Design a protein around this ligand. Structure first.
Ligand SMILES: CCCCCCCCCCCCCCCC(=O)O
Length: 139
């Protein structure tokens, strides 16, 4: 909403390759992801391209499994079909220097907080009391 926001989004705008993942299996289980999708998801190393296109922010994920693309305005709810095939109502906002993505579906909620730390993009994924953390490096 406030000014400076697209300047802060620009810090995330790059091509990001997964370089580490911690507790993603447990997060997927808590989320309700099916066994086959967990088997693939625990091994695949996605590339995430974040860009600005107009006043739209775009997050494109490429992998050897699922490719996804979402396009949104900060703070504006949108429909999202996730890589694990959930049909959600989502909102992406800024919280200071953090890009926060909240997904709502079936009376449930999960969120992904992205931040730049030591030049890497670090994603914290939370569902209830279960948290996973994924690191990405610029390509
Ligand atoms: C893109 C392939 C991953 C498939 C795993 C599906 C499990 C869904 C859990 C939420 C997805 C968000 C993070 C996974 C992709 C990423 O590294 O950005």
């Amino acid at each position: 909403v406030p000014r400076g926001s697209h300047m802060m989004v620009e810090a995330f705008c790059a091509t990001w390759k997964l370089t580490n993942s911690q507790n993603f299996d447990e997060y997927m289980k808590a989320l309700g992801v099916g066994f086959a999708t967990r088997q693939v998801g625990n091994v695949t190393k996605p590339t995430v391209i974040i860009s600005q296109e107009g006043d739209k922010v775009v997050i494109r994920t490429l992998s050897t499994f699922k490719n996804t693309e979402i396009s949104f305005q900060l703070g504006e709810e949108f429909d999202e079909t996730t890589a694990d095939d959930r049909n959600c109502k989502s909102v992406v906002s800024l919280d200071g220097d953090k890009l926060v993505h909240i997904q709502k579906w079936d009376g449930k909620e999960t969120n992904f907080v992205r931040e730049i730390k030591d030049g890497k993009m670090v994603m914290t994924l939370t569902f209830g009391d279960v948290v996973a953390v994924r690191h990405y490096e610029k390509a």
